[PDB]
Short mmCIF file of C-alpha atoms and ligand atoms in Angstrom, two decimals:
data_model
loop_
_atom_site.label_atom_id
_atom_site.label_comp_id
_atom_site.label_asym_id
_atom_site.label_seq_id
_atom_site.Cartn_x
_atom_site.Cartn_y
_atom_site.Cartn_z
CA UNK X 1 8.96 26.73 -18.33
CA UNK X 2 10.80 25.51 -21.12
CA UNK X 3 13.05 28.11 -22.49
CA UNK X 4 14.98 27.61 -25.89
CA UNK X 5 18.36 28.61 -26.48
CA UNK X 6 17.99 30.69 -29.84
CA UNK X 7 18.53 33.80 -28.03
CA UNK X 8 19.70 34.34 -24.22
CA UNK X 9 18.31 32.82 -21.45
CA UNK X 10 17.64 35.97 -19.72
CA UNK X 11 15.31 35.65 -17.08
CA UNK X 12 13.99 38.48 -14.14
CA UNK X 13 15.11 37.22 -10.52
CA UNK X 14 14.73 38.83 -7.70
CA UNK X 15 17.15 39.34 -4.44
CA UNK X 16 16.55 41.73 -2.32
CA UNK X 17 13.46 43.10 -3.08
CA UNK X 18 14.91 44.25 -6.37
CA UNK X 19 14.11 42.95 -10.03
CA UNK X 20 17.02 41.90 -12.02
CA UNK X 21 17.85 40.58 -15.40
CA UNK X 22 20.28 37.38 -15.32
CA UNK X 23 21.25 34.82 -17.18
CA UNK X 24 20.65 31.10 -16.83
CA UNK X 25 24.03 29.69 -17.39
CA UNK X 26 24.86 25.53 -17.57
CA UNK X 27 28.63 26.41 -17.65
CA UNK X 28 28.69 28.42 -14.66
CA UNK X 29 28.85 26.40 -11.51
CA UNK X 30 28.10 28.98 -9.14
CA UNK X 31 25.60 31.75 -9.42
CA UNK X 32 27.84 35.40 -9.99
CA UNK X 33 25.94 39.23 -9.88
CA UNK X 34 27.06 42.38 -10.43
CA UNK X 35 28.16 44.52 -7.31
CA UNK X 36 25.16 44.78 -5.15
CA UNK X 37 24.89 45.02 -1.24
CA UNK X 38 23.56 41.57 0.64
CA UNK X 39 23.44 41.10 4.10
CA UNK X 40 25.68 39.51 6.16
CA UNK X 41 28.80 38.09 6.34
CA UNK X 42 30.98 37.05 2.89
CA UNK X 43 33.86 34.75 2.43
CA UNK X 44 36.25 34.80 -0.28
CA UNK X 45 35.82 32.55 -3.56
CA UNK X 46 37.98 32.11 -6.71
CA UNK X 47 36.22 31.83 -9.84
CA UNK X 48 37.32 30.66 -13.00
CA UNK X 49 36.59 32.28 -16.51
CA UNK X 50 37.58 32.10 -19.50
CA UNK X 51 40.05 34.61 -19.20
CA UNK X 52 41.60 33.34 -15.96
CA UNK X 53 40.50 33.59 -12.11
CA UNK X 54 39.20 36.18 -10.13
CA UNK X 55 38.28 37.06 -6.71
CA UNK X 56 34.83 37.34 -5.86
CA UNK X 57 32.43 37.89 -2.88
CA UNK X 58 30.94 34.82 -1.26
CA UNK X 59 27.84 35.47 0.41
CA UNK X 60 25.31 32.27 2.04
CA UNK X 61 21.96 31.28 2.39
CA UNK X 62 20.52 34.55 0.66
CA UNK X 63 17.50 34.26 -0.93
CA UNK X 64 17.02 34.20 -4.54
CA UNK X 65 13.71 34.10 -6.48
CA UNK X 66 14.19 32.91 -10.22
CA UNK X 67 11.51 33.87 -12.51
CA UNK X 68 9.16 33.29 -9.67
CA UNK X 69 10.92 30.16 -7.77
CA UNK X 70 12.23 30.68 -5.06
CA UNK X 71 15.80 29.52 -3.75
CA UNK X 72 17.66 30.07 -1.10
CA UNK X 73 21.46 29.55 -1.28
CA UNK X 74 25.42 30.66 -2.01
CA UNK X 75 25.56 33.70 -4.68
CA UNK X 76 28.72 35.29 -5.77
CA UNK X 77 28.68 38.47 -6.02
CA UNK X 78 31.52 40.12 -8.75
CA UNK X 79 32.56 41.88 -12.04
CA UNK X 80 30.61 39.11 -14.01
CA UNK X 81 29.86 40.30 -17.30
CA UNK X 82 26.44 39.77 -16.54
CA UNK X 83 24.34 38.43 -13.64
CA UNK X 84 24.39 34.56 -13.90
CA UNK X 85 22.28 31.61 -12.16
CA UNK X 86 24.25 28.74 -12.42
CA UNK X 87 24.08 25.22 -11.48
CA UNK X 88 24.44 25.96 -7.49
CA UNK X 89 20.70 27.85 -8.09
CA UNK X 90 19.53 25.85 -11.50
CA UNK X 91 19.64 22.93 -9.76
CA UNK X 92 17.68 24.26 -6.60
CA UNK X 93 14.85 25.63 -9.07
CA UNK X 94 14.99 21.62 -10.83
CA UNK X 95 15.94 22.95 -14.02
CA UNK X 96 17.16 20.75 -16.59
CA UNK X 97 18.91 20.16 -20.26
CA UNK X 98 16.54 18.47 -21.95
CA UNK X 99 17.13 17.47 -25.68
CA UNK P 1 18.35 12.98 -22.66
CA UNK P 2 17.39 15.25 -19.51
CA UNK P 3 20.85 16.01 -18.02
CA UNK P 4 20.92 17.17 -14.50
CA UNK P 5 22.89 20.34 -13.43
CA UNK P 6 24.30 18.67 -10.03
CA UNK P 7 27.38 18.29 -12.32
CA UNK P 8 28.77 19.89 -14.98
CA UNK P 9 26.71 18.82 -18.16
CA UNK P 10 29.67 17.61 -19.59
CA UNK P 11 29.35 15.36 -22.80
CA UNK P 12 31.19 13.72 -25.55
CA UNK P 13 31.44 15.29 -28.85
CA UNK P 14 33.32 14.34 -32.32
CA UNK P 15 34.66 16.88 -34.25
CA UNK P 16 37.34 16.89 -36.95
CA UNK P 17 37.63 13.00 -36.15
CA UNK P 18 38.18 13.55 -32.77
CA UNK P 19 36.31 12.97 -29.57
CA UNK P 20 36.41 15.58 -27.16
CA UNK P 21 34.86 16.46 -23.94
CA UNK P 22 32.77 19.60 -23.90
CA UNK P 23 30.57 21.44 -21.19
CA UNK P 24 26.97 22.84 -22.57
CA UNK P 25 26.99 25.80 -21.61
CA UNK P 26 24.06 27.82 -22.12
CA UNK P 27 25.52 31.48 -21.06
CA UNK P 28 27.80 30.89 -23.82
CA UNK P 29 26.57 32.26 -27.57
CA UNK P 30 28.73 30.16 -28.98
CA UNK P 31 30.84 27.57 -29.19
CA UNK P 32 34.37 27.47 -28.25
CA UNK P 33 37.00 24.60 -28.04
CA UNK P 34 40.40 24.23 -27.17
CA UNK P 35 43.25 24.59 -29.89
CA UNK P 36 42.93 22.29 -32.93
CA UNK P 37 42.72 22.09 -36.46
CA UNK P 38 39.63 23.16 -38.59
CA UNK P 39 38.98 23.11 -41.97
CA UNK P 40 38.09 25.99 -43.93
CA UNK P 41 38.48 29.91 -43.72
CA UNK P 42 38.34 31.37 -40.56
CA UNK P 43 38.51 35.31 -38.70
CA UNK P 44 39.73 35.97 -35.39
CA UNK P 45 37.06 36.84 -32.46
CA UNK P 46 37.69 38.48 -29.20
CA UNK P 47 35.57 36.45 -26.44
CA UNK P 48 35.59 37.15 -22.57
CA UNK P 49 33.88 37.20 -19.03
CA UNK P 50 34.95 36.49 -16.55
CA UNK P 51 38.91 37.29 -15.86
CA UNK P 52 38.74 38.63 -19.45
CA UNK P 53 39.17 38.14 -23.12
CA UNK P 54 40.84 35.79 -25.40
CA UNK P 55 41.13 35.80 -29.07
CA UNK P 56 39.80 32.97 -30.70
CA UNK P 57 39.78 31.45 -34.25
CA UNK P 58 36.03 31.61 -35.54
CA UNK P 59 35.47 29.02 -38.13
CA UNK P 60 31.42 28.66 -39.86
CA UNK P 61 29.68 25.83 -40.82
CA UNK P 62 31.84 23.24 -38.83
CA UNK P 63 30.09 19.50 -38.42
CA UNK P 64 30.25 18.57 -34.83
CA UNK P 65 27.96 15.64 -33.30
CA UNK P 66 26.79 16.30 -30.05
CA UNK P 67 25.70 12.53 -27.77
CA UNK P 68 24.98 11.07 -31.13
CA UNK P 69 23.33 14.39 -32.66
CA UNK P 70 24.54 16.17 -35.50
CA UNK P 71 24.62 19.55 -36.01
CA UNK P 72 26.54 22.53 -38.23
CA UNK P 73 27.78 25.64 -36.58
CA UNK P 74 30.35 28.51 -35.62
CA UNK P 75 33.05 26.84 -33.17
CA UNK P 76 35.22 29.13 -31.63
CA UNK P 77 39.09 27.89 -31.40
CA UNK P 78 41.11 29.40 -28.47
CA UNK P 79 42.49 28.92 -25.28
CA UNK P 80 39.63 28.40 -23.76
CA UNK P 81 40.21 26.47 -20.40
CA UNK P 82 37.32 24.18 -21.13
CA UNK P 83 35.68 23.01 -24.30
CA UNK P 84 31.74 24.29 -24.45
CA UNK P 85 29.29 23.81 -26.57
CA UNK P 86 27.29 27.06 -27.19
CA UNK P 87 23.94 28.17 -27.70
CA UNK P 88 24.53 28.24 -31.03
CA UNK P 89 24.94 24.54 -31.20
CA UNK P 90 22.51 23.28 -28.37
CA UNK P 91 19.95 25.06 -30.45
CA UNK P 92 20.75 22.48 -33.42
CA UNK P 93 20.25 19.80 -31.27
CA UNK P 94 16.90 20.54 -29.91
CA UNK P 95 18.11 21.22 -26.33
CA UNK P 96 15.97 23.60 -24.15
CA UNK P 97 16.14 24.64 -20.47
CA UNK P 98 13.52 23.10 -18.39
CA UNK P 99 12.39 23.90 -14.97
N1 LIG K 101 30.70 35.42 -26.92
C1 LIG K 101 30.69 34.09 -26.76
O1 LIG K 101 30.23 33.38 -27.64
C2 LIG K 101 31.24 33.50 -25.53
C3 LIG K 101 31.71 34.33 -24.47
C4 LIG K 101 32.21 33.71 -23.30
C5 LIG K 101 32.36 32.28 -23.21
S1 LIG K 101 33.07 31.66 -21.75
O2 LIG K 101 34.12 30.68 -22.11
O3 LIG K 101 33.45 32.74 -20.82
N2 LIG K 101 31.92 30.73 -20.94
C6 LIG K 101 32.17 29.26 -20.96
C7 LIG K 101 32.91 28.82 -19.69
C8 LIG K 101 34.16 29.47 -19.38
C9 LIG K 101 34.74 29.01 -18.16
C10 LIG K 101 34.26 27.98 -17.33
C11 LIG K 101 32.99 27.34 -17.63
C12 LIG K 101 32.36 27.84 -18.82
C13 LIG K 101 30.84 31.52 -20.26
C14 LIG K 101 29.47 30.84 -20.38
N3 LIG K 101 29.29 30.02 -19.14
C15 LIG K 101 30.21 30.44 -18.09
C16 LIG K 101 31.23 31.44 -18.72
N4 LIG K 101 31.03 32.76 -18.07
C17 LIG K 101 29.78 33.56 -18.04
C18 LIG K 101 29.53 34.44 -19.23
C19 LIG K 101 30.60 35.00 -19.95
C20 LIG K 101 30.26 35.80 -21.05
C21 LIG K 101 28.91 36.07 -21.38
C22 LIG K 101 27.84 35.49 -20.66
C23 LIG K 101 28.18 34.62 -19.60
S2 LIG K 101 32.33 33.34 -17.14
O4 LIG K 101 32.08 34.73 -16.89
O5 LIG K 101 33.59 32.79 -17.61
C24 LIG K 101 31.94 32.48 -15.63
C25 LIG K 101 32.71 31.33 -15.35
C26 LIG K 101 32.44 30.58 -14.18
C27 LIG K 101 31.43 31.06 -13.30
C28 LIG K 101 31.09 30.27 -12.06
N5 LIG K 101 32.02 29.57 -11.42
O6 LIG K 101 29.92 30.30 -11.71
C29 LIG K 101 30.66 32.20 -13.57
C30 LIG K 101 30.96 32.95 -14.74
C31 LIG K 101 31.89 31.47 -24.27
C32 LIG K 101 31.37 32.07 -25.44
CL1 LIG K 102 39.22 38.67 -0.54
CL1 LIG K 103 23.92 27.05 -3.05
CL1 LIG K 104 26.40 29.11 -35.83
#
């Protein structure tokens, strides 16, 4: 699609086998969601906001299907103020700013 | 342009006379720029996410040009740790996600 920015990007993904509502987010570099379980083994990653670092859960290769495409790869997994897809995932799906 | 999200989408504005570096950043709602000088009346804004909030300086109707484009908005003025160019802004300019 082509989605405008007049409101929020908010987009359903889903990750394991549950529906979500997340944001598609240029400024974020990695893709951040709200305290779920994922399989696996995670690694630590520092992320930075706007209010300063924070620890976060690193988890790879989990799959990741973003309204509809599917993408396989690193997703954070945190006290984000709301789920984000960022570039790590936006750029797997071949979304771009167009203007 | 299309701008690819294998890097930051980081581009040049001009605002206030200056040129400044700014990230467009569509999970932010608005604009928000390092400390300077604005013109005008402003009111302070809380903004956060991740790591939490700062206050800002919210000043309306503010000329920025964006790659060559010109558009009025809200920019946010705080100690932000990077400069970004909201969806309040990217709107002005036409830009739209595309994937
Ligand atoms: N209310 C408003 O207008 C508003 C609020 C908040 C801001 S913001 O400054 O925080 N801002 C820009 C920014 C800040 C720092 C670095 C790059 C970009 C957010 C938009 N894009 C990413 C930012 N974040 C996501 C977010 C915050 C709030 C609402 C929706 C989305 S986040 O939680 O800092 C985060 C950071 C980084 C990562 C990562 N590494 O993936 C993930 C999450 C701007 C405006
Ligand atoms: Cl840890
Ligand atoms: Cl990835
Ligand atoms: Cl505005």
């Amino acid at each position: 699609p082509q989605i405008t920015l007049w409101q929020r990007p908010l987009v359903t993904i889903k990750i394991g086998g549950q529906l979500k509502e997340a944001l598609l987010d240029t400024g974020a570099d990695d893709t951040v969601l709200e305290e779920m379980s994922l399989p696996g083994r995670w690694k630590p990653k520092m992320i930075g906001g706007i209010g300063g670092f924070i620890k976060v859960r690193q988890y790879d290769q989990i799959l990741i299907e973003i309204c509809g495409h599917k993408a396989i790869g690193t997703v954070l997994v945190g006290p984000t103020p709301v789920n984000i897809i960022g570039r790590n995932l936006l750029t797997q799906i071949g979304c771009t700013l167009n203007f």
